[PDB]
Swiss-Prot record, chain A:
Name by which UniProt lists this protein: Large ribosomal subunit protein eL27A
SUPFAM superfamilies referenced in this protein's UniProt entry, alphabetically: Translation proteins SH3-like domain
Organism this protein belongs to: Saccharomyces cerevisiae (strain ATCC 204508 / S288c) (Baker's yeast)
Residues annotated as transmembrane: none
Gene Ontology terms: biological process: cytoplasmic translation
MF terms in GO: structural constituent of ribosome
Annotated function: Component of the ribosome, a large ribonucleoprotein complex responsible for the synthesis of proteins in the cell. The small ribosomal subunit (SSU) binds messenger RNAs (mRNAs) and translates the encoded message by selecting cognate aminoacyl-transfer RNA (tRNA) molecules. The large subunit (LSU) contains the ribosomal catalytic site termed the peptidyl transferase center (PTC), which catalyzes the formation of peptide bonds, thereby polymerizing the amino acids delivered by tRNAs into a polypeptide chain.
Major localisation: cytoplasm
Gene that specifies this protein: RPL27A
Keywords, in A-Z order: Cytoplasm, Ribonucleoprotein, Ribosomal protein
UniProtKB/Swiss-Prot annotation, chain B:
Glycyl lysine isopeptide (Lys-Gly) (interchain with G-Cter in ubiquitin) crosslink site(s): 14, 45, 75
Designated gene of the protein: RPL30
Assembly description: Component of the large ribosomal subunit (LSU). Mature yeast ribosomes consist of a small (40S) and a large (60S) subunit. The 40S small subunit contains 1 molecule of ribosomal RNA (18S rRNA) and 33 different proteins (encoded by 57 genes). The large 60S subunit contains 3 rRNA molecules (25S, 5.8S and 5S rRNA) and 46 different proteins (encoded by 81 genes).
Keywords: Cytoplasm, Isopeptide bond, Ribonucleoprotein, Ribosomal protein, Ubl conjugation
GO molecular function: pre-mRNA 5'-splice site binding; RNA binding; structural constituent of ribosome
Organism classification: Eukaryota, Fungi, Dikarya, Ascomycota, Saccharomycotina
Biological processes per GO annotation: cytoplasmic translation; negative regulation of mRNA splicing, via spliceosome; rRNA processing
NCBIfam families: PRK01018.1 (NF002172)
Protein name (database record): Large ribosomal subunit protein eL30
Database matches in InterPro entries: Ribosomal_eL30-like (IPR039109), Ribosomal_eL30-like_sf (IPR029064), Ribosomal_eL30_CS (IPR022991), Ribosomal_eL8/eL30/eS12/Gad45 (IPR004038)
Other remarks on this protein: Present with 59300 molecules/cell in log phase SD medium.
Chaperone is among the record's keywords: no
UniProtKB/Swiss-Prot annotation, chain C:
Coiled-coil intervals: none
Top-rank lineage group of the source organism: Eukaryota
Keywords: Cytoplasm, Ribonucleoprotein, Ribosomal protein
Main location: cytoplasm
Cellular component terms per the entry's GO annotation: cytoplasm; cytosol; cytosolic large ribosomal subunit
Disulphide bond pairs: none
Subcellular location: Cytoplasm
Any single GO BP term: cytoplasmic translation
Function: Component of the ribosome, a large ribonucleoprotein complex responsible for the synthesis of proteins in the cell. The small ribosomal subunit (SSU) binds messenger RNAs (mRNAs) and translates the encoded message by selecting cognate aminoacyl-transfer RNA (tRNA) molecules. The large subunit (LSU) contains the ribosomal catalytic site termed the peptidyl transferase center (PTC), which catalyzes the formation of peptide bonds, thereby polymerizing the amino acids delivered by tRNAs into a polypeptide chain.
Additional comment: Present with 50200 molecules/cell in log phase SD medium.
Subunit structure as annotated in this protein's UniProt entry: Component of the large ribosomal subunit (LSU). Mature yeast ribosomes consist of a small (40S) and a large (60S) subunit. The 40S small subunit contains 1 molecule of ribosomal RNA (18S rRNA) and 33 different proteins (encoded by 57 genes). The large 60S subunit contains 3 rRNA molecules (25S, 5.8S and 5S rRNA) and 46 different proteins (encoded by 81 genes).
Lineage of origin: Eukaryota, Fungi, Dikarya, Ascomycota, Saccharomycotina
Record-level Gene Ontology MF annotations: structural constituent of ribosome
Name under which the protein is recorded: Large ribosomal subunit protein eL38
From Swiss-Prot, chain D:
InterPro entries associated with the record: Ribosomal_eL34, Ribosomal_eL34_C_sf, Ribosomal_eL34_CS
GO CC annotations, alphabetized: cytosol; cytosolic large ribosomal subunit; preribosome, large subunit precursor
Source domain of life: Eukaryota
Family: Belongs to the eukaryotic ribosomal protein eL34 family.
Quaternary structure, from the entry: Component of the large ribosomal subunit (LSU). Mature yeast ribosomes consist of a small (40S) and a large (60S) subunit. The 40S small subunit contains 1 molecule of ribosomal RNA (18S rRNA) and 33 different proteins (encoded by 57 genes). The large 60S subunit contains 3 rRNA molecules (25S, 5.8S and 5S rRNA) and 46 different proteins (encoded by 81 genes).
GO biological process: cytoplasmic translation; ribosome biogenesis
GO molecular function: structural constituent of ribosome
Organism (species): Saccharomyces cerevisiae (strain ATCC 204508 / S288c)
Function summary: Component of the ribosome, a large ribonucleoprotein complex responsible for the synthesis of proteins in the cell. The small ribosomal subunit (SSU) binds messenger RNAs (mRNAs) and translates the encoded message by selecting cognate aminoacyl-transfer RNA (tRNA) molecules. The large subunit (LSU) contains the ribosomal catalytic site termed the peptidyl transferase center (PTC), which catalyzes the formation of peptide bonds, thereby polymerizing the amino acids delivered by tRNAs into a polypeptide chain.
Subcellular localization, as worded in the UniProt entry: Cytoplasm
Gene3D superfamilies membership: 6.20.340.10, 6.20.370.70
Main location: cytoplasm
Amino acid sequence: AKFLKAGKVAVVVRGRYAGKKVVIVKPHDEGSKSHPFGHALVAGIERYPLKVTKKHGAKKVAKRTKIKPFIKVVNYNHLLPTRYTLDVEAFKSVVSTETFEQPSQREEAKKVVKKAFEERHQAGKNQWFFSKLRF
Amino acid sequence: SINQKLALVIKSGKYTLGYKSTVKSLRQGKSKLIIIAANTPVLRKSELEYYAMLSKTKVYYFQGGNNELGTAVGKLFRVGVVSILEAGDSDILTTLA
Amino acid sequence: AREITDIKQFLELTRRADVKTATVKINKKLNKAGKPFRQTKFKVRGSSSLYTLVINDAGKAKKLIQSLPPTLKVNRL
Amino acid sequence: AQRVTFRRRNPYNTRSNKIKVVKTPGGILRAQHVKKLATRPKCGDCGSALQGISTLRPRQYATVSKTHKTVSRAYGGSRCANCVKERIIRAFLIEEQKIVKKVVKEQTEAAK
Amino acid sequence: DLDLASTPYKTLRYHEKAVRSVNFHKKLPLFSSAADDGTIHVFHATVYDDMMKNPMIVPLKKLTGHKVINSLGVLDAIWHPREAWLFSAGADNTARLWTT
RNA sequence: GAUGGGGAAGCUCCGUUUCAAAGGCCUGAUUUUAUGCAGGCCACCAUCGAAAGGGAAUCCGGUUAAGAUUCCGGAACCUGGAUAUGGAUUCUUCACGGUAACGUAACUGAAUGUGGAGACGUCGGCGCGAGCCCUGGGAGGAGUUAUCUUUUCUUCUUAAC
RNA sequence: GCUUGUGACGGCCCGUGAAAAUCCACAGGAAGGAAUAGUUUUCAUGCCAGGUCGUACUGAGGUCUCCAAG
């Protein structure tokens, strides 16, 4: 079964975001004219939302829940596919092949992605995805 | 014997050899049965077991080293992991092995 | 010693007011294999290191010596 | 055919006292004391010359920018990218073996 | 300036999105700047050849009206060879000509 | 080899972390019977011992009756310290590209944990570089020559950074 | 070719190959950071300073050591 799907969590293995968790928004099983290899389109999050205690208030809480995202075309060979899954429907039409290679379409991709991840972190759900992969 | 079961498939049906190609096959879901040698690295063994768990593939541990798996496929070199893309004239899937 | 292949950069250095003297060095060199020409070398004792300016052209040299601040002490060769 | 003397006070052929015979602009040969050569920084996990890091004297690393002392990944300036890869894989699967062991433990407790 | 330094002589950071295309006019001392916000800014730039005097750059007009199609503005801009007219090209499937 | 200890009538010897109270840092609205200091973090041990071991950074030309990597001219580099400006830190709050190895003018990172350099046996052949040696042409000078000899000798240099 | 420097290999061992000062790096996530100069200077440019002692010469059955033309 083709497990590498549109709602699939993965762990990036290589390059600047090594160790950082991602979600494959749109797979490309047999590549393209740019990227001639089985790759995936991902949108993961770089700066993890930091821990928040009852001592933190009003401004620190706003600072901790702030997440910084990233978008990258990544090879399957540098992906570790995970058993876990994540909702993706909010940003499927936002990231495509046209989204990549021509900014500032990447910028407005990053803003919708930033929104989606921050709105999902608040109202505490999918907590495993926003925890730091300890290695 | 397993050697009789495998050598038939290697002369009749579609197959693959080694780590990288088996993992590519698991990604495509075109793998049906994977064969893991005994002396394979623990990290690569765990990575194949987990990938097969994702793709929902039946897993067979070959009793003996990679040399004996190369001998089983009838090749001079050594092979750590063999997949079955297409099962041959043998009923290898429905059997215990 | 550091090469600057950059004209106005040298002129910025000359008006630093921490610079006392300058020097214009004249050379006799040949191109490719054919003909001899005349090379100039605009050198200032900078703040830390000496900056130098190879200008293979003679007209740009003719313009640059003219374009220097008149209060600055200029040295031939 | 000029013969060449040591320049510093050590008259001996130690590790520190290497000689390069260099021709000077006075038209004469003279010795130059060779600085002890810089080595590659190495993988703490691997034992291999890690790529993209400048090769300098230990003290000489203080002068140079951080982009010559670190590659951009996690464990960048200290590991291999292969040894980082291997510990991403390892820490993931160990963390998931913990889950499976909790599943088995919770099942056995329910059985008793 | 290829005479002044290796750094930029003047850094100007005004655009809202990615500065997609910047082009000189051939005859008149003018240059444009078409970013991804559907906006072209036109600049006057005097260059003084003989005298050791740094080039003056002044802004002129913010040209607008271009439609933004999925976070994408003006993909290209090219000047007319001999007069001060400018050819734009947006994501709105439409090229435009600007006039004095 | 002191210190703590323990011997010794003693001069002094044993011992080098030992059953030593061996000390140096952080937190705080000022510490609630009213202006008397509370809580925490870390657990080995002074020192001497190398002008051949490890070690930040200097070269060239010149100069005296006798001094030179020390003096002079020129040109450098290292280390420590205040601080000043430009640039960055993006619509305001710690930057991005590359599938990837990685790249960048920057791109905060405390306690604590770790890694690299320092930092390392000996030989063999092979590759590459520098100096020396051999040599062709050419630009100068000294020589020998009755004979033969485009002859013999010498100069033609390039430091740190 | 000689001198010397360096690179990749291959032998020789259960012989697995001084220490420390000093310098750098990673993991970590404490703290800090804006509306008459926010936080940060491992980016560029600019400023100042660097004490004591040795330093001459010789060094040739009879102490050690370096350079080495045809």
